[PDB]
Write a protein that binds this ligand. Sequence first.
Ligand code: HEA
Ligand code: HEA
Ligand SMILES: CC(C)=CCC/C(C)=C/CC/C(C)=C/CC/C(C)=C/CC/C(C)=C/CC/C(C)=C\CC/C(C)=C/CC/C(C)=C/CC/C(C)=C/CC1=C(C)C(=O)c2ccccc2C1=O
Ligand SMILES: CCCCCCCCCCCCCC(=O)O[C@H](COC(=O)CCCCCCCCCCC)COP(=O)(O)O
Ligand SMILES: [Ca+2]
Ligand SMILES: [Cu+2]
Ligand SMILES: [Mg+2]
Lengths: 186, 139, 143, 551, 68
Amino acid sequence: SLNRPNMVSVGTIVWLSSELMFFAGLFAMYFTARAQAGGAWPPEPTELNLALAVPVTLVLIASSFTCQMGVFAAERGDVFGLRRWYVITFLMGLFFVLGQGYEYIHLVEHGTTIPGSAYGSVFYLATGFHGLHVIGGLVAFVLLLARTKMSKFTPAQATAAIVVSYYWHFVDIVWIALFATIYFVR
Amino acid sequence: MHIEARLFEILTAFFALAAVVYAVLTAMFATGGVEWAGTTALVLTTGLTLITGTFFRFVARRLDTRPEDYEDAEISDGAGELGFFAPHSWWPILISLSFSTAAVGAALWLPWLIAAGVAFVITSVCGLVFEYYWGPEKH
Amino acid sequence: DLPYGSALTSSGRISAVTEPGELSVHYPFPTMDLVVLDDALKYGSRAAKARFAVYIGPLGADTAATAREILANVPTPENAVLLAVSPDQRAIEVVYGADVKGRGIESAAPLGVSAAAASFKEGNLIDGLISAVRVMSAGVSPA
Amino acid sequence: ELEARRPFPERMGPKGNLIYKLITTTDHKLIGIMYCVVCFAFFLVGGLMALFMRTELAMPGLQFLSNEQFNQLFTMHGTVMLLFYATPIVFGFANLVLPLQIGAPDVAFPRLNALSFWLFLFGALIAIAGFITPGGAADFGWTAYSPLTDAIHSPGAGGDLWIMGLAVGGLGTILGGVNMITTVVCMRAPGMTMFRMPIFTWNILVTSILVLIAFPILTAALFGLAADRHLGAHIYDPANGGVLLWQHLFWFFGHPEVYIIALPFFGIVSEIFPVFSRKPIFGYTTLIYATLAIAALSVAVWAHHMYATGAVLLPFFSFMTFLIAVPTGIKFFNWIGTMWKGQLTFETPMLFSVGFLITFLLGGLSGVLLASPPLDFHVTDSYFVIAHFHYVLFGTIVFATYAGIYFWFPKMTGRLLDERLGKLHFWLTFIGFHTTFLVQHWLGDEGMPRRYADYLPTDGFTTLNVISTVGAFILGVSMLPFVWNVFKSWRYGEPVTVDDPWGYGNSLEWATSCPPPRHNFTELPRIRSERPAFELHYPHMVERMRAEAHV
Amino acid sequence: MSTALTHGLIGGVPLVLFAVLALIFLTRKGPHPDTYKMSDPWTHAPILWAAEEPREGVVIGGGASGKW
Ligand code: HEA
Ligand code: HEA
Ligand SMILES: CC(C)=CCC/C(C)=C/CC/C(C)=C/CC/C(C)=C/CC/C(C)=C/CC/C(C)=C\CC/C(C)=C/CC/C(C)=C/CC/C(C)=C/CC1=C(C)C(=O)c2ccccc2C1=O
Ligand SMILES: CCCCCCCCCCCCCC(=O)O[C@H](COC(=O)CCCCCCCCCCC)COP(=O)(O)O
Ligand SMILES: [Ca+2]
Ligand SMILES: [Cu+2]
Ligand SMILES: [Mg+2]
């Protein structure tokens, strides 16, 4: 029987709740800069494309499923299923990062930079900090997959997998808020 | 564990009320607009407590009463097996030093120092996480 | 469990209390003198490999053999030397275990007794004690 | 019946007894001790800066100091003695006794607990290291207003080290907060329910919850400012509405910060009062509600720190600031009711805990006046607000801290601090404190603004400045007896061996030895009430305790 | 005003206050009991001090005696 709370999970939950207030600053800056826009909020050089941000968002929304499948495999004692699903998750995350980088290059070429405008500052700051969190998540995947083959698959390793999944479900839920508030509510 | 769950939603109710009051009272008879800076903070302060409250509620519904949650409980009930705690480790100081190096690099804008700091941070975190999992040497 | 604010715990240990601003040791000697005697005992136990002990209290009606049944209370009673002094009745006794035999104690114990008696001509209860311990510890060989 | 003991206990350990188990340590007790030592080491440096800026401000004209030096000096004093001394001492007190109070053998995530300490120390060092540069440290106040802090108006390197040091230091606080929440929630003894743990634990729990809100937004703001200074972004541009973005973001942090360093020191005195009064705590249930109410209120109260602008909704913040002053009154009344009709004895802890009451009341009374915008219209950025926050800070951070130190020194060390050498300390620190801060109300009212390096002879205020300087040097010499006492009463001093040097002890840490073993406990009593050590000792009174409680 | 008076007063008062408060408190008697004289009856409980070195019915042999 199980009759205790997992404290490795409560620790990560409270930390993830605290980390939500970090993005509060970025959201505040965005909404403050948007207010003093006057006319068109995205200025003349800025042209947002939905031809690249939509597929990337869909990929970042398909990673959670695979991640949860890996977690489901973890709870049974399956060490191989976890590895397969986590590798797929890693690849999808890498796709997200490369897509975002490509969009950055495209935007910079047409004259939307950090020192160029007030829009550019907030846009790049918010999306760059999110990218940094994603890279941290990828590093976590690599570290966990490296640890899964050091020793026998004990419940502690399953707990580690579950908490890493928690973290991932926090990088893709904060990107559906940003995508909704940037590309739709302009 | 109901007291823990209640302590968070008690705050959640107040935070939601404060955010809603602030947003409306600023829209009318307040110079400018809706005061996006203060409104943004409170609507995420509520979320901070909401996440923890919901998680605690689910955990409390999952598991039954513990010796800690029992009024007339005996010391003999909790006897058994706690779990694992690290006796000693010298990795934390290395992690702190790595982060300090990265910070000093970022302060004076020395990209090489930043790169070195990031490499050190990754190595130190790897050392910390792979501490009680390394197997014996193979020879 | 007898004194005020004492209780017998589930492990058999005692937990006592003191009044705010009171002491719990209350020896009638200065702290620095206690430090000197402590380090003297500590460094005399080394270099001789036999632990030294000191007794201050009543020696009842025998003053020669009641200082012998109390040697059994010190840790490792064999390979241990004890100096018992009686303030009420002028008496010095030296008692040593069967593991100290032939290590130089026989020719040392009179010297320690003499040092203690000589220093007891004044109110130097603790000064003579340290002198006696120092003289006795310097005669016993580790072997 | 008759055991063998040592004439005096051992003074110190042998060679190589401390050094290695100082960098690899995992024990929470040792971490708390290190907190305390480093915090006091920083306190002395901060006090030296205050002495420097107080000496120059006794006579008109720049005698030995400069404008730049004075600016950097008050910027660094208020930073060091607020973020490098005050915040970490909270976690110092939390690491000493909280696991003992809850009946746990350890905290959750101990390696994280050590990582927090090291983050603290190195962040503090990198922030202070701004004095090594030829330019100097930060010279723009601890508040860091815009656009004074951009690269145009503050192009120094000290100001960047300031930001980066604060950012490094802030991570340890959050890690400590999550650690304390987890420890309280999970690590409890059988029969220790939520409503049976001491008030100190409740205060630390709610303080950690408040930390989890306050600090991340400050980190975000610091990152934004670094982005502006190093990448040439437009975040806090005045044309962009960024002069007041910074103020909102900063004061969302700033006021919860000043409540982070209040509640734990409420809990310390709330623990000390019942012991020396031979009487239980008064209104146990209502105290936790007061704590919860003030903690909840201290989030929607942030703009009372910016009235002199023209861009806040005055009624909202004024009303909330008025409301945040009720449960503090409840706490005061509960303390007075705890002391009422008891057997009072004034040892060193009790003396400091009483001094706290006298100081904090006037501090809070002055604080309530500032909450009305008409009154703050004349008195903001003057020497009256300085008097306010010094009275209100010096009660919780000095008197309560010293009370806790005198209380828990024997518990943690096994030695007793001297008494005739602590009364001198208290009286010096009490006489020398009012002499240096009481006349600043008049200074602020008469038209002396804050952060002034110089004044003219024909200004009127010179005598009121001499008095403050006289008083400040008594606050400098008051530290000598305390440091001497701690240094001399560590190797020597009266052995305890009684595991309760005060008697009538209430909490669970007084049910173990002085000092406690590695794993804190060798046995546990039965938890039935919130006074387990008073249940264990004096069983005869148990029935009385259940009969006289309600009136 | 009167730099001699200012400097001679911001640095003189603390020392006098310290001296007075050190006369008041540090001249009192503490809780440490008075020394035992070898001219009064021994009233304290028995002592039996011992050492802790070497670390970790009884067969014995030998003795001595004394007098003062
Ligand atoms: C948090 C708690 C705290 C503490 C403990 C103190 C301590 C003191 N403070 Fe204050 N102070 C603040 C909180 C505190 N302060 C804050 C939040 C600010 C805002 C900053 C800003 O303006 O930006 C401030 C700023 C401030 C000013 C503003 C100056 C101006 O604007 O013009 C003044 C003016 O007199 C003042 C006075 C004092 C005095 C006389 C002490 C005395 O109690 C200190 C004397 C104590 C000592 C301990 C002296 C020690 C020295 C030795 C014994 C020498 C040896 C040392 C070495 C060898 C290293 N402080
Ligand atoms: C550090 C601890 C601390 C605490 C506890 C407080 C507590 C309070 N503070 Fe704050 N405050 C600071 C630290 C603190 N503060 C600092 C550091 C600054 C300056 C920052 C800077 O700008 O540099 C500051 C500045 C500050 C300002 C801005 C002033 C200005 O910049 O001009 C205001 C304005 O509203 C304020 C109000 C209050 C109020 C109403 C309380 C209340 O918490 C106190 C209430 C207490 C009581 C009321 C007494 C007890 C009550 C009773 C006995 C019942 C009596 C009932 C009635 C009177 C009705 N303080
Ligand atoms: C005798 C003498 C000259 C000594 C001077 C000593 C001295 C006063 C040093 C100050 C150094 C610093 C960091 C100054 C800033 C103030 C400050 C923060 C002080 C330290 C504070 C402190 C104790 C905090 C905690 C410690 C901590 C967290 C770490 C400190 C940061 C560290 C470790 C940095 C220092 C490392 C250092 C000095 C290395 C320089 C060595 C070399 C050869 C660098 C030169 C160099 C250059 C110049 C390149 O351009 C370059 C480009 C691409 C690749 C490489 C390099 C490269 O190596
Ligand atoms: C200081 C923290 C800020 C972090 C925000 C992350 C930025 C995301 C990168 C987006 C690229 C856009 C560049 C652009 O259009 O302008 C470019 C300049 O931007 C940069 O140089 C970005 C470098 C930022 C450093 C990366 C992170 C720092 C590491 C610190 C770790 C502690 C070109 O502009 P320009 O040609 O001058 O008009
Ligand atoms: Ca002057
Ligand atoms: Cu305030
Ligand atoms: Mg102002």
